[PDB]
Amino acid sequence: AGRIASFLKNAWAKEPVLVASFAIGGLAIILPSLSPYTNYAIRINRATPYNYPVPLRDDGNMPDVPSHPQDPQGPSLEWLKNL
Template sequence: MAAIANFLKTMWNKEPVLTVSVGLGIAAVFLPLVSPYTKLTTMMNQSMPYVYPVPVRDDGNMPDTPAHPCDPQGQKFDWHKKL
């Protein structure tokens, strides 16, 4: 233990910026493992679906809905202007 303390004291005296950056890097690796938010984040990520529903395409019975978002002929936005 005395060797580690002596090493840290020597490093702090010679290169304080390098010592702080190494300390912050070590903290950045280990702090998320003990953080209480890690469990909550994991639970939220597991509850989100990987597959989302696909929007309905025009089958000919929906005159106000374009067949495709990039379809220039199917863009009838009169319903949008009335909102």
Template sequence: MAAPQTFREALRRGFVPFFKHAWDREPVIVVSVAAGLAGPLLVYLSPLTKYAREGNAKMPWDYPVPIRYEAGKTGPPTSV
């Protein structure tokens, strides 16, 4: 089987031949793309993500709204 001449031919054969061809031609670009994609992907694989979600679930996001003073409807305003 002959080696692909262009990236398009390598991609038509599949992902593995495409990455082999890209690695043979431009290894710096392949490494930089892999490093750039690793960061966002590893965030979801990290065990700390689970604990961050649990901590956010325990934090109340709906705080009670204070009742405003309205003459005749509520009691006199108090200072806290």
């Protein structure tokens, strides 16, 4: 308070446009790191398929890779369907 509160109030009095712009800018800078949905956004961008999932040669070992799109093993995006 004191000097800082008086300066904030005087800036709100004299130049409200600058106060609003600085507040919006600071909010838009510091919120995105804190918000948890940011990671979700990245995953959504990873979920969207633009190129074909080119199949790899099944020389045996790999269990995780599905042998058919309907097969359960492999990445799933039920989270996006729910969210």
